[PDB]
Amino acid sequence: MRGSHHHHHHGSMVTMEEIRRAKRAEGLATILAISTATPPNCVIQADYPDYYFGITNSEHMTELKEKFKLLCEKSMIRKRHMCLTEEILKANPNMCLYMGTSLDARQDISLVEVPKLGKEAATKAIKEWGQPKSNITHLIFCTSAGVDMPGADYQLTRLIGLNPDVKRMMIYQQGCYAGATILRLAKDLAENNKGSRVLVVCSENTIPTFRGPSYTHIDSLVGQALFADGAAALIVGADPDTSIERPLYHIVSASQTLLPDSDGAIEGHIREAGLTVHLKKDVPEFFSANIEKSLVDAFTPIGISDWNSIFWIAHPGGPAILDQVEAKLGLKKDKLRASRHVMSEYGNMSSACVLFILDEMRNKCLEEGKATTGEGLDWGVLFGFGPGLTVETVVLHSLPI
Amino acid sequence: MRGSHHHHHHGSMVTMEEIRRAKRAEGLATILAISTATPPNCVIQADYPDYYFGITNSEHMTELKEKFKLLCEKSMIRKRHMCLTEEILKANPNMCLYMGTSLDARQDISLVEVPKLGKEAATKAIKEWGQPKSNITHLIFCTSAGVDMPGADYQLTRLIGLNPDVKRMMIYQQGCYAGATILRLAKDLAENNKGSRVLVVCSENTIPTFRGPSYTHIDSLVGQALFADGAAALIVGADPDTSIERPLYHIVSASQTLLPDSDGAIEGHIREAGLTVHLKKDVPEFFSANIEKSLVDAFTPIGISDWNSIFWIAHPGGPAILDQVEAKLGLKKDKLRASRHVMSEYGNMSSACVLFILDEMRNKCLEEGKATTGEGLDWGVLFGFGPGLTVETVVLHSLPI
Numbered sequence: 001m002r003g004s005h006h007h008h009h010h011g012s013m014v015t016m017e018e019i020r021r022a023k024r025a026e027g028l029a030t031i032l033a034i035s036t037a038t039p040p041n042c043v044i045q046a047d048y049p050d051y052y053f054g055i056t057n058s059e060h061m062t063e064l065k066e067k068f069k070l071l072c073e074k075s076m077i078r079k080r081h082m083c084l085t086e087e088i089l090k091a092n093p094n095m096c097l098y099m100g101t102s103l104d105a106r107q108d109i110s111l112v113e114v115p116k117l118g119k120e121a122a123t124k125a126i127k128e129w130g131q132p133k134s135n136i137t138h139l140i141f142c143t144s145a146g147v148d149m150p151g152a153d154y155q156l157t158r159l160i161g162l163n164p165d166v167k168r169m170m171i172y173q174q175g176c177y178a179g180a181t182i183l184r185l186a187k188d189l190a191e192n193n194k195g196s197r198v199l200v201v202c203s204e205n206t207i208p209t210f211r212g213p214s215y216t217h218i219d220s221l222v223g224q225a226l227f228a229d230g231a232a233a234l235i236v237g238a239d240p241d242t243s244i245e246r247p248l249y250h251i252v253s254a255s256q257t258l259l260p261d262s263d264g265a266i267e268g269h270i271r272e273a274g275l276t277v278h279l280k281k282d283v284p285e286f287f288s289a290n291i292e293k294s295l296v297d298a299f300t301p302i303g304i305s306d307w308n309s310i311f312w313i314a315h316p317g318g319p320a321i322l323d324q325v326e327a328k329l330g331l332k333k334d335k336l337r338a339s340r341h342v343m344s345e346y347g348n349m350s351s352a353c354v355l356f357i358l359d360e361m362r363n364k365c366l367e368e369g370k371a372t373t374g375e376g377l378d379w380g381v382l383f384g385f386g387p388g389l390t391v392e393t394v395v396l397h398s399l400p401i
Numbered sequence: 402m403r404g405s406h407h408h409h410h411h412g413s414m415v416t417m418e419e420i421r422r423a424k425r426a427e428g429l430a431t432i433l434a435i436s437t438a439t440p441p442n443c444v445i446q447a448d449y450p451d452y453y454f455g456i457t458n459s460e461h462m463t464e465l466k467e468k469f470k471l472l473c474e475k476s477m478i479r480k481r482h483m484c485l486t487e488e489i490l491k492a493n494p495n496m497c498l499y500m501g502t503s504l505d506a507r508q509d510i511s512l513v514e515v516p517k518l519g520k521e522a523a524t525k526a527i528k529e530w531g532q533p534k535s536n537i538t539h540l541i542f543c544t545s546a547g548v549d550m551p552g553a554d555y556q557l558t559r560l561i562g563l564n565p566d567v568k569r570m571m572i573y574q575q576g577c578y579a580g581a582t583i584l585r586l587a588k589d590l591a592e593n594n595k596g597s598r599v600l601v602v603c604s605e606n607t608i609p610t611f612r613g614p615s616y617t618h619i620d621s622l623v624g625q626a627l628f629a630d631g632a633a634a635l636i637v638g639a640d641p642d643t644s645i646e647r648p649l650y651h652i653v654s655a656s657q658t659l660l661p662d663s664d665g666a667i668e669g670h671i672r673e674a675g676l677t678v679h680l681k682k683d684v685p686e687f688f689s690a691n692i693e694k695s696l697v698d699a700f701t702p703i704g705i706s707d708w709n710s711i712f713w714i715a716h717p718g719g720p721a722i723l724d725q726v727e728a729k730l731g732l733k734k735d736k737l738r739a740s741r742h743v744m745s746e747y748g749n750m751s752s753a754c755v756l757f758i759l760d761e762m763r764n765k766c767l768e769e770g771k772a773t774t775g776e777g778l779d780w781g782v783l784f785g786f787g788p789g790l791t792v793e794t795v796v797l798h799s800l801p802i
């Protein structure tokens with residue numbers, strides 16, 4: 001009948017609307033647990049130039065070694081964790097060359113290691129969350145350290161013992177912005193599916209990227225100074241039961257954009273020689289020059305324009321990027337503290353960094369008695385940077401401690 | 402107060418709540434356009450054994466060739482489209498070996514071909530849709546034919562000229578169920594974002610899977626009899642404006658599950674020799690034995706138990722899979738018509754198949770004057786089959802013609 005409602009000519013369509021109403025969640029996606037893992041083996045950055053040029057038979061490349069020493073010194077990295085050991089490299093001479101035929105060997109090690117390290121981080125996140133693993137409805141797995149069919153998502157599912165009907169999304173080779181990407185993904189999964197609990201795992205390592213030095217590619221030396229191993233895990237859910245679950249952050253919005261005229265600035269090829277990485281000298285300039293446009297597009301609907309009034313999580317893959325953004329925007333020197341703390345303690349773990357940093361920030365906030373998980377502030381930004389060039393921008397809201 | 406006034410923005414609770422209220426769409430993710438593309442070069446299946454054993458210099462493997470002839474005759478494939486030509490293969494003897502070092506040569510061709518073919522399909526889908534491409538907010542790109550950084554999603558974005566702010570999700574190496582996967586993905590993206598319009602593109606080809614014959618891997622011969630090139634594109638959006646947009650299918654629900662005891666039944670490895678594919682002989686038994694459980698889980702909440710009362714789209718990875726599903730469930734002989742039609746005309750194009758089949762069904766329904774896009778029926782199921790073993794189950798609702 002006539003009134004302030006419309007009608008449907010089919011009952012099945014009415015049934016569809018009932019289904020949709022019942023299948024979806026109400027609130028914003030929230031982060032409920034965060035955990036990290038690293039391989040036990042660790043290299044001290046100060047000792048790495050001698051170790052690296054030794055193991056790659058390159059002691060005679062004197063100019064090159066001097067450049068690498070400067071790279072490791074400017075890296076602002078104290079230590080890095082690596083599955084890759086002297087023993088493993090000795091058994092794989094082709095990985096020690098610059099472009100040796102070595103993908104198969106890299107793959108044979110990495111494809112087992114990726115979900116293994118991921119499981120270690122996941123188990124902890126599940127333990128913090130406190131709920132049975134049979135309540136996890138979704139899994140997001142993220143890596144750039146080796147592709148396989150079925151993927152690391154399948155391997156993790158069987159390793160942990162998740163429900164066979166767990167809904168999986170496998171995010172392969174998206175590189176250093178992907179830690180933000182899977183937050184963008186987890187937000188839509190969690191908010192569109194009622195009661196859904198999303199396990200989010202990333203796991204990165206240096207197995208496919210390690211290679212000997214070369215005059216042909218000084219940009220490769222940059223990678224050898226920075227890349228590191230690490231895994232991180234999250235439990236994400238909307239509508240938390242606060243009697244058993246403890247929200248840490250709301251995922252308010254998530255954006256992604258391509259930087260104009262940056263085409264080709266960062267490239268990564270999966271080849272017979274493994275994963276090759278090429279970096280133009282221009283990369284930090286591109287990011288620092290464009291980052292405010294992302295801040296403005298993200299925070300204008302929130303009414304914020306003062307970038308010192310929000311808390312910051314920024315992928316610290318290149319120190320120059322953080323340094324130039326800090327200067328360009330006039331950030332207070334403590335804004336990127338948690339970000340730089342993770343880079344110093346762990347190095348560039350690609351997608352895992354921003355999640356290490358969230359954990360570091362909520363931990364320090366708790367033990368220093370800060371008012372929020374966002375260093376006492378309400379609103380925050382989390383950035384992923386990587387190939388495209390691509391900027392991922394996640395707006396977060398903190399929770400009271 | 403009396404004085405000059407400046408402006409103030411709303412506090413956290415009001416701002417958080419307004420964001421949450423404004424963020425979501427209301428209705429179900431709906432498919433608004435479908436388009437397909439294939440490379441111009443086509444091989445007739447009846448001639449393929451002679452062609453295949455000739456180009457790989459294996460004319461003396463007369464026994465194997467006779468087996469391959471039976472595989473191609475049983476394939477129920479008439480023709481296949483392939484970017485790979487006789488001319489390309491003669492210039493790449495290593496691709497013609499069973500396990501030749503050839504990934505680099507395969508990548509150099511495939512990484513260009515994947516977004517190119519995808520672009521052809523995308524352009525047509527946008528044209529059917531009829532809206533300016535600047536209204537595309539999301540892009541999902543799906544391929545298993547070659548990985549790169551940045552990915553095919555980036556390449557397609559630049560080739561087409563999508564907004565740099567387009568939200569990209571790159572789905573790599575998820576194999577033959579991924580056509581359903583990206584429907585599952587597009588559903589959550591479209592439904593959780595008000596006004597969002599999702600371009601969904603998949604592009605598959607045989608460049609990394611082509612290889613010479615082997616007595617050790619008859620399963621590889623199976624692949625050489627089936628795998629083919631193809632791309633498909635979709636526009637997906639919730640809350641269509643029916644004055645400018647025309648709905649074809651509603652994506653009602655999307656599930657994913659792993660088959661018990663099916664470990665290793667389908668594997669795909671990225672190696673120095675390209676993409677190797679392994680298939681156990683039990684694969685059709687695994688799917689047909691377990692498929693009814695997926696039907697029950699998907700359709701019980703909809704009140705349906707008669708599998709002939711729904712329309713069917715099933716990935717035609719193997720004709721044996723469709724044959725045993727049909728037999729096991731007691732399907733009428735025309736249920737899988739459109740599915741086997743795409744297989745016959747195109748072969749196994751991996752993720753693209755189920756989207757070709759959706760296109761085939763709505764085209765045939767329109768030109769035969771059927772009542773709905775679902776062969777006159779209201780509810781339908783779409784199946785992806787692949788590594789895991791993984792069954793993706795999408796429930797669809799047709800639109801009236």
Ligand SMILES: CC(C)(COP(=O)(O)OP(=O)(O)OC[C@H]1O[C@@H](n2cnc3c(N)ncnc32)[C@H](O)[C@@H]1OP(=O)(O)O)[C@@H](O)C(=O)NCCC(=O)NCCS
Nearest residue numbers: 074075176218219222279280281283317318319320385386
């Ligand atoms: C690596 C890094 C910490 C080095 O610190 P720095 O302040 O650049 O140190 P300097 O510039 O004094 O010295 C670096 C040397 O390596 C060179 N170099 C650095 N990056 C290079 C690149 N991508 N390609 C070629 N050369 C490079 C510099 O030109 C210089 O060479 P030179 O002494 O022969 O002239 C800094 O460049 C950085 O963080 N870069 C970002 C790298 C990046 O894009 N990472 C991925 C982010 S997602």
Ligand SMILES: CC(C)(COP(=O)(O)OP(=O)(O)OC[C@H]1O[C@@H](n2cnc3c(N)ncnc32)[C@H](O)[C@@H]1OP(=O)(O)O)[C@@H](O)C(=O)NCCC(=O)NCCS
Nearest residue numbers: 472475476577619620623680681682684718719720721722
């Ligand atoms: C391949 C296929 C078309 C063959 O047709 P068919 O009707 O099964 O023909 P048959 O099974 O009688 O004969 C097939 C021959 O190849 C063999 N064969 C079939 N599939 C095989 C496999 N996966 N691995 C090894 N051998 C296989 C059979 O054993 C038989 O060899 P034999 O004569 O020495 O015993 C059919 O089995 C099929 O469609 N299989 C599914 C393929 C698949 O898994 N696709 C998914 C790819 S991602």
Ligand code: NI
Nearest residue numbers: 217219220278
């Ligand atoms: Ni380089």
Ligand code: NI
Nearest residue numbers: 300303304410
């Ligand atoms: Ni304002």
Ligand code: NI
Nearest residue numbers: 341342345360
């Ligand atoms: Ni610390």
Ligand code: NI
Nearest residue numbers: 402403404406
């Ligand atoms: Ni006043």
Ligand code: NI
Nearest residue numbers: 406407408409
């Ligand atoms: Ni005013």
Ligand code: NI
Nearest residue numbers: 406407408409
């Ligand atoms: Ni005031």
Ligand code: NI
Nearest residue numbers: 410411412415
């Ligand atoms: Ni107001």
Ligand code: NI
Nearest residue numbers: 618620621679
């Ligand atoms: Ni095999």
Ligand code: NI
Nearest residue numbers: 742743746761
């Ligand atoms: Ni046809």
